[PDB]
Symmetry: D3
């Protein structure tokens, strides 16, 4: 026989995962792990299953960062070069998408038919969020705040929800924790939008105001653009995708003149109050008091 099939080797896997492993070697904050831990106080998934869920979520998170940095044309990630500036965009993109299917193979280890459907629905939502974000970015059409939050719910919220939905599929309690975790994912993204423009640690981690370089209609940027439609400086800056710090500093000063950062702090305050009220409701109906989830809520909105 002319052709003889070879088994896949560890050396080849190491090539395929080159970009993924590079990113995993960079220290992150591990918010999603602490979120899983805080929900497990209530759901009490055993560690055998929980370890699979934690691995799945870490894999999907790192892979999504690989792809996001390419689609956004970012330069820094966790204060280090983005993976594709080392390995090129094609290998980094292929590595991220590969890991999406390695993670599905990992979910299959739960031997839980509902978990498969949960995974598919979440990967569908993730791409629906990325697709609408890109659509607005490329068309230079500023979404409303309500459209933006629906996109965030699909995107950033999709992974938060995936983690807790898999936990629920591995527990017999009949309480719906997803509205709460979706709310926490929305809070987390709005804080991220804010800190991208205001936090010095975020300047060290990704560059100054990198959402402006990337042309993104983020939460405070939307508010600023829509607060004065007759002034088109900020949306035109987005169009220009500026790498220059002078343009970005001018944009940041414009956004303070429209009070878009106080606006964003006030919305986060309102959503945190809803989150606390939801936690208190869950506990009033039979769940033990959960200190860890209050600490996660406080931590993600620590600034602001």
């Amino acid at each position: 026989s002319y052709y003889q099939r070879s088994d896949w080797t560890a050396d080849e896997e190491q090539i395929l995962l080159g970009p993924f492993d590079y990113l995993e070697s960079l220290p992150g904050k591990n918010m999603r792990s602490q979120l899983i831990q805080s929900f497990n106080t209530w759901l009490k998934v055993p560690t055998e299953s929980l370890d699979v869920i934690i691995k799945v979520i870490s894999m999907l998170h790192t892979a999504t960062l690989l792809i996001d940095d390419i689609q956004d044309q970012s330069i820094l990630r966790r204060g280090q070069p983005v993976a594709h500036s080392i390995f090129g965009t094609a290998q980094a993109m292929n590595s991220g998408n590969y890991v999406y299917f390695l993670a599905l193979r990992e979910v299959q280890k739960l031997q839980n038919p509902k978990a498969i459907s949960i995974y598919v629905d979440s990967l569908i939502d993730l791409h629906r969020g990325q697709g609408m974000e890109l659509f607005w970015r490329d068309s230079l059409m500023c979404p409303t705040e309500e459209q933006y939050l629906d996109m965030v719910a699909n995107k950033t919220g999709g992974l938060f929800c995936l983690a807790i939905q898999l936990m629920q599929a591995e527990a017999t309690i009949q309480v719906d924790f997803i509205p709460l975790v979706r709310l926490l994912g929305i809070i987390f993204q709005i804080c991220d939008d804010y800190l991208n423009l205001k936090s010095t640690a975020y300047t060290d981690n990704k560059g100054l105001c990198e959402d402006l370089t990337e042309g993104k209609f983020s939460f405070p940027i939307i508010h600023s653009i829509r607060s004065n439609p007759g002034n088109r400086q900020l949306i035109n800056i987005l169009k220009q995708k500026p790498r220059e710090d002078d343009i970005k500093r001018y944009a940041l000063s414009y956004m303070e003149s429209t009070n878009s950062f106080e606006y964003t702090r006030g919305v986060v305050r309102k959503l945190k109050t809803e989150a606390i009220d939801t936690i208190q409701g869950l506990e009033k109906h039979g769940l033990e008091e959960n200190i860890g989830i209050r600490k996660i809520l406080a931590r993600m909105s620590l600034e602001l």
Copy 2:
């Protein structure tokens, strides 16, 4: 009362997400994976309702793979028309393709077959393993051996051929193993494609002159030509240059003729076709009915070689 109210996904939003995908589906193709499915169905006799799901799944995945491949290769034309990302941009075209990978998975679940998910995942894993090794060689400028190339092709082009027939086997009541045959057909198909990309007027019209050279790809005849004289480094350096210019590509093409790499490639395809026919005859001698359709697909895919 909640500050945020989740909205349902709408048809208008789906139409945005599928903009690049719908664009590519509106361009007429050769629909050969459908003829392959039909020719194996002569033996497997999958019920119409399951077969329609498999055909849809394979069509979706094929188009989605084309969206992504054209981006990763920086192609210009697809089916003689602009590549989708030259209309929608690379980011939306890439996202649309990967989106469809998961819509197709949702479609696969309609078979309600406990084995179907693992089959799908194993195939998507193979597809990415093949693409990743091909990009690895391209970017490092390291020419694989022919054997390494065929293992990569088996993963890549073969992975979707194999997915179609593996789902059909999972849905059929007979237990014959058709996968070694279909993987061989996928390899033949890809080598023929490598040849036609460089030596076919129809492919020049559909994808540009010798576009594998522009993309820097170590394709089957290119590997042979590079390795037949390692002291001459013109061809591998042309690959490095990723030329869009027809003059460099015509020179490279003339060099590959000088190393007799197209004869070499035709001879390999002939040997593989002979193995394919022998395998088909073996399957028929052991019970299966004579399959004219699968011989036509084999004759069709190697027509110009």
Copy 3:
């Protein structure tokens, strides 16, 4: 004794300043604004000495506007020859054009007409208002409505048509108002131009294939095609891409045929021509002599529609 002595402007320096302008004037054009002036002069009978100043002013302004337009649109060809800034650079071509705007103003003063300056200024103001709105839509990727487009065209293309006839009226002894007619003729002229840019071999030779697409312009048929199916976003995304490639432009052209946008455009031009002829007949019925020349200009500018 002064350290600095002011020198007089010289012919050699003027020749430098007008390098781009003289280049464009040496390229044969259709000289249709001169036929328009002549056809309205059948009615207005401006004395030869004043008419020569107006003809010169309008020629100067037209060429200068072309210098600037080709830069702002990033055009490549003009009258089948290189755009002036691809010889002299954008900065000198732009400065030469804006220079001529003020040389033409100096020429206008030779009419010694107290009203002529205001007429000139109002027209240059309209011209910049039209160009500014067109650039605004182009850069923001926001498709105007047809009504917004025509208001912009009325300012832009119409502003110079109107300037010619408004100066002629100011210099004539009759008080008939010809401006609504000439603004209508300017709109017809521009819509015909939008059509011919996409669907005329002579325009392909003079400015390139479908150059409005390369420039990203929301022209009359392009607006119709975009708005006829807002769920398909291929055409507006092609505009965003500013394609120089003929394959994308041919696809866009084929899409616009599929939305029936050229029939739509021909039908609009037919209605506007009917209004123009009715207005002409109204002017003649109320005293003015029958004007064959103005009917020929109307027939000429819409010939291929």
Copy 4:
């Protein structure tokens, strides 16, 4: 009727003036206003007419900056991004040229036929100066100092002269103030050439030695090039339009080695002496002593 003409709206005007209004929102030094005020001590134009003249000159100045920054491919203006790096070059250019005709409409408010001719002649001179400057820049041909001053007289001098010529057209005194104001405009431009290469505030406002990046044959650059024609480093640096600070610092050091900054200080000294002598002559022949115009002369040459 198929087409109905719409009136121009305030929203559309706000679009057309987007780039102009952006620049006007950036604080300048207001030299031309203080120049007008110092000459009005002698010309005593009433405020109704003077307000029109001041508005016209401000409009033309800001519009000329919009266009100059595009033609020069500048990056900063008054320490902020150039207007075209926000709005793009086409809209910024159209906005500037639009304002040239809005300013002519403003001049018409004087109902002074001579003022129209003065405006046209000055806009003609302005473009003659810009055209010769660009011609030398693009052809890499170093003008003589005398050619450079003729160009400056047309360009920078054209607006100084416009302001005072409009004032003279609104006054009955029969004294010719234009030779003096032209001299002040030449002094102002030579100081500007110098400060572009030597002043730290100018480095903050436009970047380090931005005349080198722009390839301009400015007053000290001409002197340095011509002081040693056998050394072609500086003219070749101009050709390269360097954005790198290392090349610019090397060029600046070369220009000090040719004593081009002392040369420029000495010329400014000689011209200031002529300016003072001209002022004293005007006053000896019947005009009151003008302290303000001496302060303007001192201020524009304060450094140097």
Copy 5:
């Protein structure tokens, strides 16, 4: 025992170093410097063994000079095929060419002629002096006079013509001075080349349409055209733009016809050929045998003028 052991240079490494050089030598040329050598050998009768070394030295240097010239000029085609640096990159092509300059020097030493090294060095010095002045004018956008241009050509193109015949004279037993004649032939050859680059279909196929314009070169007819009307600056500004576009080049070509620069160039070539024939006849009248071959080379190099 030493940590480092020096290895001998290998054939495989030489093959790498000469990759760009061997590529260019595999492309058929006109081999006119070989006909020139043969035609002067009718008079000089250099022994075969020395003549073979000179022929090899001149071939090596010519190809090496082409490698470098194509890089310095940013050329695209050479002998109708891709320039070597568009395959191997500029750095390896440049290094390979300069390498061969010193391999040729090693070859020259085989003549064992005490004068040969100085002759070689003086010629390489002249070659670089000519290239350096040509680049100086190109980069500074300063049009030389015709006399300055010819001095540069005498250094550049003439330097290798002169090297061949100077080595032949050094190896021959007669003392006749042929260098003024051969330098004149080198000048004629270069002016003809300048003309054919702009006005010859064979040169369009071998190097592209009017490639001297793309390269920004002040060639013989271009100098004439620029200087015949210094108030028109279109042509020198086109040189500045280094146009790859055929439309700009066709316009420039049409402008040069309008200044009658090709007639001017043909007339100059005619005068120089007349001087060359008179010099040849003078050499023959004073003893040398009638040389048909050198008249054929002269007729060949000016054939199309």
Copy 6:
């Protein structure tokens, strides 16, 4: 006669040498001059001949820098702009290659037939070294350490050897000093490789880690790449030719994790011991003790 040949003028020579003279006006360290002086203690070449040799070596050194900076696409040289960023690559390249033949004309002044052959052989070796270095760089194929040292012996070693071989051709002593000088040239290049990545003065002189920007397989880079072939981050960084300091700092940190700088220090130590042993051997066999050559050895490896 239609054409009259002109003599070459000093003004034209000044044009041809523009880039060369620019580089010569920048202060270097003069290692090769001190090397020649230290060997002359033994060879005692008279100053008339030695002055020619010193001039030849200086010329070839400066010319090689001109060309290397172009082929490497460097940005800084001796802390100043590379010559081609002023004069353009074509004139700078032509000037360097011109000087190669001016130096050969200078060598002819020795009227020493062996000196001509020595010069040719060294220029041949120089190009053989540059050619193999470029071959590996462009093909992304990491040489072995032994291949790298053979290339260094041809390249950097070729000029060291040329200097001392010309000295030997002008002396009657029958001792072979070339193995020693070749060893010193190898030591010098390995120190240069190291200091390019580790010395702050080298950061000021050429930029941070400029060998990474240039894609060069230098001595410590080779060791790091080959120490872990399963990790391909560093070779992929070389492929990317990064101008970004973040990527370069990441690469530098990777190379410390593979101990490639300690490895390089240890090799230099071993070679210096061989150099000292070779010097001691030459002196044991009849040569006077040479303090200067020990100081040169100490100085070139001063760091490390």
